[PDB]
Design a protein around this ligand. Structure first.
Ligand SMILES: [Cl-]
Lengths: 230, 13, 230, 13
């Protein structure tokens, strides 16, 4: 996240880090229950990657984190790597996470929910804080930012904006490399709800250009259908 | 779901 | 490819197109023999995707093409979606391609082959011809462009350039979205041989910035081991 | 491998 700020430790308890088997972080994710994580299909997660829950500082020696194995990867079958549409993957964990004060789930919206353009939402992750930086930050970052209408978004991105996408930002902050898969949450009825999944944007992570997110309402039925069947 | 035990503190509302 | 030119039809006979089942092109690839295609790991190919060989004009339905099914996908286990290192995948076809005038294989280099900086090589594909374009071009594009040394490429990209990458371009032309997976070919002992796999670059496909390719000499031993065991 | 039966023609080479 470019121009964001450090989060309070444990304040985004559903935020997970996807790491390879050596501990290298490449994408974010969100816990939606004890056995399942939602992330971006373009992250390219496999069953050798690991989910890390409860982390704040990746450079910390001591933190009580849970390193969970992935039993199964469910990539949405309509994902397309050129248009980057339907950018969503579900991970079924081989071992259930243990919820606690620093590890718990985000809510999912209903397919009919509506989040108005202009609402101030939040996105978190360990993505680059500058596109020219060599490494991802050790500490979780956060930024608040506005949602945009698809019509306003199209002013910046043209026909690249599809119905399963939602844009936010262009206000001094930006999701960036390594943030993908992480949450874009907005408050609904007292609870943070998952409205977007960090998906794509400009390779400079420009803060005057809107980031693009997978629109969870357009994809929640597929999520529910996959959870029911597996 | 979606209500952290440790409250987030944000600069932007 | 931005600022490329149309190829002579059938003159890049190993160039294949990776499409979903409605004919939507999302990445390139190269035939390395009758049963195998090499492409980029970030394309996210699955066994529901199809390989099309012998194509020139994707807006024509009168060309004699071969639509081949994928039996298995072998993604390199060191690929990483954040650094985009080791961006290569191999596809084993369930039906062998039939070699002909317009369909045949590119040569793989040996791991000790050297390709000097400044050599003029070629890249092909149906990637965007402008980053703001909505659609990929119908006819197969080609560009000539010089190889850069990793040291000079670091002037533009810093520490993002790794050992399994090689840069080419910054010469008024550029690979772009949808060119990924296709070939960067150079002549070695009289024959076109695969030196690079289109991998990543600037999201504006700027022609004064080099494209980054997966360095096939750093990966051919994984290729040959996968072919030998399968 | 690597020859093509239909020769390529390039401006830039
Ligand atoms: Cl994939």
């Amino acid at each position: 996240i470019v121009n964001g700020e450090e989060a309070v430790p444990g304040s985004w308890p559903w935020q997970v880090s996807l790491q390879d088997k050596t501990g290298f972080h490449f994408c974010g994710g969100s816990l939606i229950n004890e056995n399942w994580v939602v992330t971006a299909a373009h992250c390219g997660v496999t069953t050798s990657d690991v989910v890390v829950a409860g982390e704040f500082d990746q450079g910390s020696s001591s933190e009580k984190i849970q390193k969970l194995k992935i039993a199964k990867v469910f990539k949405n079958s309509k994902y397309n790597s050129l248009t980057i549409n339907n950018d969503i993957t579900l991970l079924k964990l081989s071992t259930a996470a243990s919820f606690s004060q620093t590890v718990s789930a985000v809510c999912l919206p209903s397919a009919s929910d509506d989040f108005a353009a202009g609402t101030t939402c939040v996105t978190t992750g360990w993505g680059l804080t500058r596109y020219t930086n060599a490494n991802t930050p050790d500490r979780l970052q956060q930024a608040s930012l506005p949602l945009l209408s698809n019509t306003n978004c199209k002013k910046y991105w043209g026909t690249k904006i599809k119905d399963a996408m939602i844009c936010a930002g262009a206000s001094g902050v930006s999701s960036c490399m390594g943030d993908s898969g992480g949450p874009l949450v907005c408050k609904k009825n007292g609870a943070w709800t998952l409205v977007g999944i960090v998906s794509w944007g400009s390779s400079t992570c420009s803060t005057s250009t809107p980031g693009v997110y997978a629109r969870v309402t357009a994809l929640v039925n597929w999520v529910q259908q996959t959870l029911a069947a597996n | 779901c979606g209500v952290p035990a440790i409250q987030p503190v944000l600069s932007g509302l």
